[PDB]
Amino acid sequence: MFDKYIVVEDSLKRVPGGVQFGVRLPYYRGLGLSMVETMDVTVDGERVPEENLTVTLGDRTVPFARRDDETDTIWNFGEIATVTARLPHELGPGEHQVGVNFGLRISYFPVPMVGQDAKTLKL
């Protein structure tokens, strides 16, 4: 869908204890966070667990584990969600490759909608 735009460019920032970056879901409409069945995040060769993912949409930050409860919250189309990842090891200064795969629980689709992106940002 928008698989070349998921990892926003020039968005890799260093949060104390982790790294945050902008993500746009590979879908053509606003989708609630509960329907994000899988959001696999890799930051330079290591997949980030869901307990290490906090999605910040607007001013509301939700641990990705508790996303099922966040049915009301909607990921707006084109909105850059700040997907903070509490990486166990700090990202050393320089160029880092961030790649996000998406599996969306679309109701009118028998199988989850799949998107994927892998960009090379820097901090």
């Binding site: 409409r29 606003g30 189309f77």
Partner: protein, 322 residues
């Protein structure tokens, strides 16, 4: 009867996604091409839905007055899989639908594009709520289905004993794909599909060989997973009978004039328009052909998407075929 040229703002989803054109910009671009009919995905370009402010709706009406546009169809999306591990109770689906019923009524929309997967029971329960607001509910007939599919037949049998003119159909043009779309073919080729097998698949689609035979044979000749995906694409895209619309002309409220690529000659490569627009014309159709630019997904990774130019060429094609 006149077929009105409309545009689904879905067509500009690319430019809206990258914050290159706003909703005002999208409606102005539609007004530039004379395609005053506007079909909107509230979940796509109206953040805050369904909890929008009255000021938003006043601004929407001000937009429409400024650009002479008319809001025609609202695309409702029913998230029956909202809650993991279960489906929405039909009672929950009633209130979720009521949201779009009220949103569309406030926007001034006349039709609601209901997805093809909604059960006829849900359309039966929300029917009184729709009559409260005088809202037409149009089930989307998109490929891999047609006006003779058993699911559509059960919808018809459910809405024949209800006898309500607010229940009807929104046919897609993907049920009139007479060629394997070239944009899809070249996308598959640049995803790692072997070109000769792709030509084979395209010829098989032209011969209407069944998706099962095509998948089996492409597998036998040696096909990568992308190639078997190209073969499975025949399941989705199908060529239905254009004349079948004449039977159901009364229950067709909106047509998604979808397209993938408009060449320099204002020609739609694959989808059958030279055969369908005459059918609508002799069917007495008086509605909107909403330009649904679909090729942006396929010309995405190696081509600059110019949604406005493609939609403009499509609008010219429609104007010529009308």
């Amino acid at each position: 009867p006149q077929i009105k040229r409309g545009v689904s703002l879905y067509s500009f989803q690319e430019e809206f996604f990258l914050r290159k054109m706003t909703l005002e910009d999208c409606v102005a671009a539609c007004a530039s091409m004379g395609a005053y009919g506007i079909e909107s995905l509230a979940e796509q370009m109206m953040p805050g839905f369904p909890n929008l402010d009255d000021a938003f709706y006043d601004g929407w009406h001000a937009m429409m007055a400024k650009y002479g546009t008319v809001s025609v169809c609202h695309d409702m999306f029913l998230d029956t899989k909202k809650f993991r591990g279960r489906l929405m109770t039909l009672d929950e689906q009633v209130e979720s639908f009521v949201r779009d019923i009220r949103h569309a009524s406030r926007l001034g929309c006349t039709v609601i594009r209901v997805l093809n997967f909604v059960s006829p029971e849900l359309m039966e329960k929300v029917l009184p709520h729709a009559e409260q607001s005088n809202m037409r509910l149009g089930l989307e007939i998109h490929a891999p289905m047609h006006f003779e599919h058993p699911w559509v037949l059960r919808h018809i049998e459910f809405m024949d004993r209800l006898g309500s003119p607010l229940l009807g159909f929104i046919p897609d043009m993907g049920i009139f794909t007479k060629h394997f779309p070239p944009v899809m073919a070249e996308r598959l080729i640049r995803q790692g599909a072997t070109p000769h097998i792709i030509e084979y698949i395209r010829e098989q689609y032209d011969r209407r060989v069944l998706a099962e035979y095509v998948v089996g044979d492409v597998r036998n000749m040696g096909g990568n997973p992308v190639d078997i995906r190209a073969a499975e694409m025949l399941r989705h895209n199908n060529w239905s009978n254009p004349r079948r619309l004449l039977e159901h002309m009364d229950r067709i409220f909106h047509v998604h004039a979808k397209f993938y690529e408009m060449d320099e000659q204002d020609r739609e490569t694959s989808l059958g328009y030279e055969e369908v627009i005459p059918v609508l014309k002799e069917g007495g159709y008086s509605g909107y052909l909403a330009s649904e630019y679909e090729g942006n997904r396929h010309i995405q990774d190696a081509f600059e998407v110019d949604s406005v130019e493609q939609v403009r060429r499509h609008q010219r094609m429609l104007a010529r075929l009308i």
